[PDB]
Design a protein around this ligand. Structure first.
Ligand SMILES: CN(C)c1ccc(C(=C2C=CC(=[N+](C)C)C=C2)c2ccccc2)cc1
Ligand SMILES: CN(C)c1ccc(C(=C2C=CC(=[N+](C)C)C=C2)c2ccccc2)cc1
Lengths: 189, 188
């Protein structure tokens, strides 16, 4: 195992620890355990535990973007709705982490940078889908795919920030309804 | 006396909230900003958290009172002003509100208050939407409540991205997006 592959195995272990315990639980001891190596090796391959935490978080969100993706043959409406509000049960720990990364972004510079980067990734996926569906003729763009993507992502972020508070008139069903509706308005004139 | 000193103490809490945020809302500083002894605030407010939360609610209520327009301007302008004004003087209010949304994750009292301010915001948006629909200016393809939730959600999200320093999401871009979604929601 060359150095890149040790760095990599440790990174993946850190991804599991992130999805199982969150940011608080990503101690070098738990990461070293999950990777099956001695802590000293984790310190030798990742000199900043903070940097390791952030990069692992980024990789987790990337994996979330790959897990939510549908087959190319699927309708473009369905694809976009998956990339924004997928109800797939496998995504729970990822979302739970992303949410956390938001909060800790207020008090941790590195986590804030990583969170911004993940927002850019989310946007990239949404734009990709909007462009493909536009070229296919299913979506109707009266604005650029970038702006539309930022507005949809904003809708999801706000509706989630309200969903977590426990308001009854905004529940899972309401969430999906709203997201589908804004998609209809933005791309099906 | 009874409610007037309570009101002066509340005004103190509000000023300290707009000036420093929740962290600086200590009874020792609030009492000084009110010109009273530190114990009287304990006479008037059982829990310090109760004071922080109630004063926050009052701050947001005042924000909404400042953002309400002359009732004769176009309904679109009233709604927008109720949603997304770019006035710098509001940033101390906005700041506080942001702070609240964060502390709601770790403080049930501030959580209750924050929920309450969100419902107030909602009630205002619904008011303007219904009034504009009656006036024939707004065209509703959905209930004013759902439209309100989607618009407020747009504002909250775009704010969350705006605070990160995203260059493509700045003041101007924010305005553009909000205007656009209003156009889609009420002018089909
Ligand atoms: C960090 N951040 C602001 C957020 C991050 C993610 C989410 C998500 C989500 C979508 C619908 C939900 N529903 C159905 C309640 C719950 C979460 C989500 C976003 C994209 C793809 C799949 C799920 C929301 C907010
Ligand atoms: C805590 N929370 C979810 C939020 C609290 C306040 C805001 C606001 C706002 C609107 C536009 C902005 N721009 C132009 C950057 C900045 C703040 C805002 C809300 C209502 C009236 C005026 C401004 C947004 C989110």
């Amino acid at each position: 195992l060359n150095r890149e592959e040790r760095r990599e195995t440790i990174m993946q272990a850190a991804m599991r620890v992130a999805l199982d315990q969150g940011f608080t639980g990503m101690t070098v001891r738990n990461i070293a355990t999950a990777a099956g190596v001695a802590a000293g090796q984790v310190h030798h391959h990742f000199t900043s535990s903070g940097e390791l935490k952030s990069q692992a978080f980024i990789r987790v969100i990337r994996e979330m973007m790959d897990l939510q993706r549908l087959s190319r043959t699927a309708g473009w409406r369905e694809q976009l709705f998956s990339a924004l509000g997928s109800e797939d049960g496998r995504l729970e720990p990822y979302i739970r982490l992303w949410r956390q990364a938001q909060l800790l972004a207020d008090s941790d510079p590195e986590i804030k940078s990583a969170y911004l980067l993940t927002m850019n990734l989310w946007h990239d996926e949404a734009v990709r889908i909007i462009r493909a569906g536009h070229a296919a003729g299913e979506f109707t763009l009266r604005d650029s795919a970038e702006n539309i993507a930022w507005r949809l992502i904003s809708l999801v972020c706000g509706l989630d920030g309200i969903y977590v508070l426990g308001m009854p008139e905004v529940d899972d069903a309401a969430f999906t309804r709203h997201l589908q509706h804004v998609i209809q308005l933005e791309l099906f004139s």
